[PDB]
Amino acid sequence: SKNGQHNEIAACINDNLMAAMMHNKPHFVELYLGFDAKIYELKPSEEV
Amino acid sequence: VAAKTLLIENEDGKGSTRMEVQDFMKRFHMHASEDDKTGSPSTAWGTLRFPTKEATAPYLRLSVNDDPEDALLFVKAMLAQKYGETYDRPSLILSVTGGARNFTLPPRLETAIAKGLRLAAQRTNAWVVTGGTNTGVMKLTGQIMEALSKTQSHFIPPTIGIATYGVIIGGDDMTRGEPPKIGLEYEMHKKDPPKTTPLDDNHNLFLLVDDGSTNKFGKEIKFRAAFENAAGQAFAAPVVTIVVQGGPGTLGTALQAVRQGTPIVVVDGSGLAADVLAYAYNFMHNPLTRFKSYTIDDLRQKVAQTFNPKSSQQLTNLLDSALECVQDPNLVVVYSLQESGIDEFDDCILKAIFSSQGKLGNKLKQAMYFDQLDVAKRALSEASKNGQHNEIAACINDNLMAAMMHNKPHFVELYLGFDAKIYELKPSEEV
Amino acid sequence: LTRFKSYTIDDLRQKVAQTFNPKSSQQLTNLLDSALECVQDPNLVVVY
Amino acid sequence: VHGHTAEAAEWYVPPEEYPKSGGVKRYLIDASMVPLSIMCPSYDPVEYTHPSVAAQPVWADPADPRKIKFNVKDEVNGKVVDRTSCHPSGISIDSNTGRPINPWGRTGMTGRGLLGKWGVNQAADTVVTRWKRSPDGSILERDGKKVLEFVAIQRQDNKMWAIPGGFVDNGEDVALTSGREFMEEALGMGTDLMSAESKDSLAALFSSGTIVARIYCEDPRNTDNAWVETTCVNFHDESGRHAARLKLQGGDDAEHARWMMVHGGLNLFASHRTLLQHVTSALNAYF
Amino acid sequence: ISFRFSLDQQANRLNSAVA
Numbered sequence A: 001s002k003n004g005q006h007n008e009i010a011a012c013i014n015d016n017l018m019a020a021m022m023h024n025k026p027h028f029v030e031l032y033l034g035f036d037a038k039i040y041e042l043k044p045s046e047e048v
Numbered sequence B: 001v002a003a004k005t006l007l008i009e010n011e012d013g014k015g016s017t018r019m020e021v022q023d024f025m026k027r028f029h030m031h032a033s034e035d036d037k038t039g040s041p042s043t044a045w046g047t048l049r050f051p052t053k054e055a056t057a058p059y060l061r062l063s064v065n066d067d068p069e070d071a072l073l074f075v076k077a078m079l080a081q082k083y084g085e086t087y088d089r090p091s092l093i094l095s096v097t098g099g100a101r102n103f104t105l106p107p108r109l110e111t112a113i114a115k116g117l118r119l120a121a122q123r124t125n126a127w128v129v130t131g132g133t134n135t136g137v138m139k140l141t142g143q144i145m146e147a148l149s150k151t152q153s154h155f156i157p158p159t160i161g162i163a164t165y166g167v168i169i170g171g172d173d174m175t176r177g178e179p180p181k182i183g184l185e186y187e188m189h190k191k192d193p194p195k196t197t198p199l200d201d202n203h204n205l206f207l208l209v210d211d212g213s214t215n216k217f218g219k220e221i222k223f224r225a226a227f228e229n230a231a232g233q234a235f236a237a238p239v240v241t242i243v244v245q246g247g248p249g250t251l252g253t254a255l256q257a258v259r260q261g262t263p264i265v266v267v268d269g270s271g272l273a274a275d276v277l278a279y280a281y282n283f284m285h286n287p288l289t290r291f292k293s294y295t296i297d298d299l300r301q302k303v304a305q306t307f308n309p310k311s312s313q314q315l316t317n318l319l320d321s322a323l324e325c326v327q328d329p330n331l332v333v334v335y336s337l338q339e340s341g342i343d344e345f346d347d348c349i350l351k352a353i354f355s356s357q358g359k360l361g362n363k364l365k366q367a368m369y370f371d372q373l374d375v376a377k378r379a380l381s382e383a384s385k386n387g388q389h390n391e392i393a394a395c396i397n398d399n400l401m402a403a404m405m406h407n408k409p410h411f412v413e414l415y416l417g418f419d420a421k422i423y424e425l426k427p428s429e430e431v
Numbered sequence C: 001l002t003r004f005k006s007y008t009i010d011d012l013r014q015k016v017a018q019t020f021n022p023k024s025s026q027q028l029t030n031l032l033d034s035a036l037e038c039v040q041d042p043n044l045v046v047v048y
Numbered sequence D: 001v002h003g004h005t006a007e008a009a010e011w012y013v014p015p016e017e018y019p020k021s022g023g024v025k026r027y028l029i030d031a032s033m034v035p036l037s038i039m040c041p042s043y044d045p046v047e048y049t050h051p052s053v054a055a056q057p058v059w060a061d062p063a064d065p066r067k068i069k070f071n072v073k074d075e076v077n078g079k080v081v082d083r084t085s086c087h088p089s090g091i092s093i094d095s096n097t098g099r100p101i102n103p104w105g106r107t108g109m110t111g112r113g114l115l116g117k118w119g120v121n122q123a124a125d126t127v128v129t130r131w132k133r134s135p136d137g138s139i140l141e142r143d144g145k146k147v148l149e150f151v152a153i154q155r156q157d158n159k160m161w162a163i164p165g166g167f168v169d170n171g172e173d174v175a176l177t178s179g180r181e182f183m184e185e186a187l188g189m190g191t192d193l194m195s196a197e198s199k200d201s202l203a204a205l206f207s208s209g210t211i212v213a214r215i216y217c218e219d220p221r222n223t224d225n226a227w228v229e230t231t232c233v234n235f236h237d238e239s240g241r242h243a244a245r246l247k248l249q250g251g252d253d254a255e256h257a258r259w260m261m262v263h264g265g266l267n268l269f270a271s272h273r274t275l276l277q278h279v280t281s282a283l284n285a286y287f
Numbered sequence E: 001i002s003f004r005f006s007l008d009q010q011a012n013r014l015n016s017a018v019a
C-alpha cells in the first residue's frame, strides 16, 4: 500500500477474501473487506 | 421568491445596515473578453441548484480587480440572510488544496484525513475553502463535508469554492439573463466548448474569479490568499492550509501561504507534491536518524520523477521555490501515519495553530476547542516561567468566559487555578 | 547533569548585571566574587 | 558513460540588460568565446558609464585613468587603496586609453558602469556561521557531515538573497569594512539600539575571524574596465552562545535577514555559492 | 544525551572588533 502497489492488492483481494471465507478465518475476512474489496464481486472457482 | 434587500455589515464591524441588492452588487465587474480591463457589471450572480442536493448554493462571478473585503462582506451578508444576524462566527479557517486530477489514496490515510477534517470542522465551526471544482481532492473534501450535512442539524459551516471563471462550463448560460437566477438547474454533463471543468455540487458557495481569459489556470491563487488573510484578520481567526498530494500549482499556493505567514499542514504519504514538501521538511529540519541519508540530489530526482519539467532551468526554479518555502520550520507541520498516528491529525492542526503569530487568548481558545489540556498547561507554564505573567492575566478572563460557555470544566478549573478572579467577568456585548 | 553543561561565568556575570544593576564594574566584580565564594562548599547549599 | 562531455565550460557571462541603467543592453557573446587567450575578432563592446558615477562622488576615481599605478598599494588623497588583483598574470594596461583590461575575460561592455573605481573593486563579504542545531541540542548531520547555518540578507535592488558585504572605503581595511557592513545591513545598527553586553557578545564573535578566500566575483555590474574581487571573512561560532544573542532586523539596503542552511542548490547573488563552498570546505561541513 | 554531547564537542587570522 505504501509503495504504490495498490493494483496488485486489488487484483488478488477477491480471491483471498473468497479463500478466507471458505476456511473460517473471520479476522482475515474483516481485514480483506477493510482493504477495498467489494463484497458483490466474488467469483466461483469452477464454471456452472 | 427572490430577495430584494440585504443586510450588509458596516466597515466599522458594529452592526449591519439594510441596503438594496442592486446597489451593493454594482461594485462587482465581469470581463466579456481578455482585451477588456474596466469591464461591465456582473450579471452572473444568484443560486445554482444541483441534482441530489437539498440545499441551494449561491454563486458570484467577480473580477480580479474587485476588493476581497467586498466579497467578504458578500459572504457575511449571505450568512446573515440565511441564518440570521447571530450566526456562528468561525474561529478557524481550513484551506484544502491539492491535486486537481483524480488520484487514489490508501484507505487508512483517506479515513484519517476524512476523520480529522470532519472533527476539526465540526468542533471549531470552521470555514473550509477549496478550489470549488468537481474533480479530485476538492470534490473529495466536498464529499467529506457532505457527511457533515448529514451528521449535523441547524447550522452548516460554509464551503466557499474559489475557481477561475474562464474554465467553468456554463459561464455563458450563467451570464445571460436578468439575475438573480433563483434555483438555476446546473447541468454538469453538458459539453460547453472549450471547457471541461464542472463545479462541485457539495460546495455551499462559489466565487468565480474572471480576467477575460479562457482555459488558463492558476489565475485565482493570489485573490484566494488575499481573501483568506482578509477573513483571518476580520474574524481574528488563524488560517491553516492543508496540503494533500498536489501538482505544480499546489507549490505556488503553498508558497503564497507561507510568505503571508499562514501555516501549512502537509499530509505525508499522499504522494506527489506533498511527498516533496515533506522530503524537504525532513531534509532541512528533522533531527531523527532515518532522515540522515536525505540529500538535495535525491530530492531533485524526486521532483523530476513527479512533476516532469521540460527544461533544467524550470526544475532548478521549482526546487529553489520548494526549498525557499520550508525555510521557516514553524510554518510547516508534516503529518505522517507511521510516526504520528491515525487519530493525531487534529493535534497537527493545533500544532500549526500554536506555531503562528502570538495571541495567547486565541491559542488558548483553540486549545480549549480541541480538548488538549496538556498543550494549554505547557504553554501557560512556559509563559509563567519566562516572566510573561501579565499576558496570562490579560487574557485569562476571556479564556475563562469562553471555557464556561463551551462546557469544558477541566479548562475552567485550570484557568481558575491560574489566578483568574471569578467576579471580573465581562459580557461580550454591551447591555 | 547535561543541561548545566553550557553554563559559563560570562553568562552568570550578565545575569548578575541584568538583575542587580551595579553602578561600577568593580562593584559587579566584588558581587560576583562574593557570590562565587559563597557556593564554594557544595554541602552548605541545597537548590529546590 | 557520457561520451562527448567536453570537460565543463564553467565560464561566467553577465546578463544582457545592465541593472538600474534604464534598459541599456550590452553586446552579447556566447560563453565559449570569453577568455582573453583566444583572439575572437568580432568584438564591438559598448561604452557606458552610469550618471551617479559620472557625478564624481568621494568613492569614485577620476574619469581620466592616466598616471594611476596598478597592482600595488596606491595613495589617493592620502588614503591607501589596494588595486592588486588575485589573478596570477596580473593586470595589463591598454596603451591607447590607459584604462585597465579585465584579465578574467570579456563582458562585452567597456567603461566603468556602476562601479566607481577603475580596475579592481575590492569587496568584503562577511559569513557569520553557526552549527544548525535541533532543540535537544544535537547538531544536524546530512551526508555524514555536520550542517552549518549562515546569516543572509535580502538585497534592496533585485530582491534576491545574498551574503552581507560591501565595497571597501578609502583609508580603511577589510576588518572594519566587514564588521561595519554586518552591523549596518544585518542588524540595522546606526542607521543606540543594543547596548553593553550584546556588543560584548558580538565582540567575542568578532574576535575569531578567518579569511577563507580572495576570489573573482561573478557580479552582473562587472565590465571590461571595472570588476569586483572579494575577500571573504568567516566568523564561526563553535559553541553557538554568541550567535544566539543576535537580534536580526533588516536595515539600510537590506529588506529581511534570516539564518539559512548551506547547500549546493542555493541561488545567491554573484559568486557567493563559491564563497560558501570555501567556508564549508574549511570547516568540513556539508555542501 | 550526555554521550551525544560529549560526542558533539568531540568533533589568515583577522580581528574585526574595531568596527
Ligand SMILES: Nc1ncnc2c1ncn2[C@@H]1O[C@H](COP(=O)(O)OP(=O)(O)OC[C@H]2O[C@@H](O)[C@H](O)[C@@H]2O)[C@@H](O)[C@H]1O
Pocket (backbone or CB within 6 Å): B096, B097, B098, B099, B100, B101, B102, B130, B131, B133, B135, B138, B197, B217, B218, B221, B246, B247, B248, B249, B250, B251, B253
Ligand atoms: N483548480 C483546478 N480545477 C480543476 N482542474 C485544474 C485546476 N487547476 C489546474 N487544473 C488542470 O488539471 C490538471 C491537474 O492538476 P494537478 O497538477 O493535479 O493539480 P494542480 O495543478 O496543482 O492544481 C492546483 C489547484 O487545485 C487546488 O487544490 C488549488 O487551490 C490550486 O488552485 C492540470 O494539468 C491543470 O491543467
Ligand SMILES: Nc1ncnc2c1ncn2[C@@H]1O[C@H](COP(=O)(O)OP(=O)(O)OC[C@H]2O[C@@H](O)[C@H](O)[C@@H]2O)[C@@H](O)[C@H]1O
Pocket (backbone or CB within 6 Å): D059, D114, D115, D116, D117, D121, D123, D124, D125, D163, D164, D165, D166, D167, D217, D219, D228, D230, D253, D270
Ligand atoms: N567602488 C564602489 N563601487 C560601487 N559602489 C560604491 C563604491 N564605493 C562605494 N559605493 C557605494 O556603495 C553602494 C553599494 O552598496 P554596498 O552595500 O556598499 O555594497 P553592495 O553592492 O550592496 O555589496 C557588494 C557585494 O557585491 C559582491 O560582488 C560582493 O561580494 C559584495 O557582497 C553603492 O550604492 C555606492 O553608492
Ligand SMILES: [Ca+2]
Pocket (backbone or CB within 6 Å): D164, D165, D166, D185, D253
Ligand atoms: Ca550590501
Ligand SMILES: [Ca+2]
Pocket (backbone or CB within 6 Å): D165, D166, D181, D184, D185, D252, D253
Ligand atoms: Ca551597505
